[PDB]
């Protein structure tokens, strides 16, 4: 994971310095939870464990630089917020019926600046429309972009 550029390398160091408060050179869930609690997040020990065992390739219970760097640079997981995706759902749902149709996503894509025709939007709905109603609900809209 060390094959990054010096700049990016410096960033995670500063972060590693946060996660290694005892100064042993490794991260545990206790140090992790401390950082989380400091910047404004509070996952439980099990959730802490989850990400710990993800990056911990030695399976030794502590996160080393390369493992941390994997979590930090690669993020380890493929998703992002996920739970706020249902908040963003209402944003795409401009008509406000609890479903997102092509026309709705069409407005939203235009809001990004990158234009597309209605057909490209319909294409997206065709693939994400699991119940085949011509609209996408939470899970359809979610898995349209960020899968579970």
């Amino acid at each position: 994971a060390d094959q990054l550029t010096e700049e990016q390398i410096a960033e995670f160091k500063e972060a590693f310095s946060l996660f290694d408060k005892d100064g042993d050179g490794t991260i545990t869930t206790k140090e992790l939870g401390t950082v989380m609690r400091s910047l404004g997040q509070n996952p439980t020990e099990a959730e802490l464990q989850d990400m710990i065992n993800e990056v911990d390739a030695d399976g030794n219970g502590t996160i080393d630089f390369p493992e941390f760097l994997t979590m930090m640079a690669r993020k380890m997981k493929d998703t992002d917020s996920e739970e706020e995706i249902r908040e963003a759902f209402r944003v795409f749902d401009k008509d406000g019926n609890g479903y997102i149709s092509a026309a709705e996503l069409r407005h939203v894509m235009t809001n990004l600046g990158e234009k597309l025709t209605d057909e490209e939007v319909d294409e997206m709905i065709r693939e994400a429309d699991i119940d085949g109603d011509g609209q996408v609900n939470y899970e359809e809209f979610v898995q349209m972009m960020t899968a579970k």
Binding site: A88, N111, L112
Partner: peptide, 18 residues
């Protein structure tokens, strides 16, 4: 992905990412 006359993006809204 290669797209000339099709959407170059779509997912960039909710997974805009950091």
């Amino acid at each position: 992905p290669n797209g000339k006359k099709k959407r170059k993006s779509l997912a960039k809204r909710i997974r805009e990412r950091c």
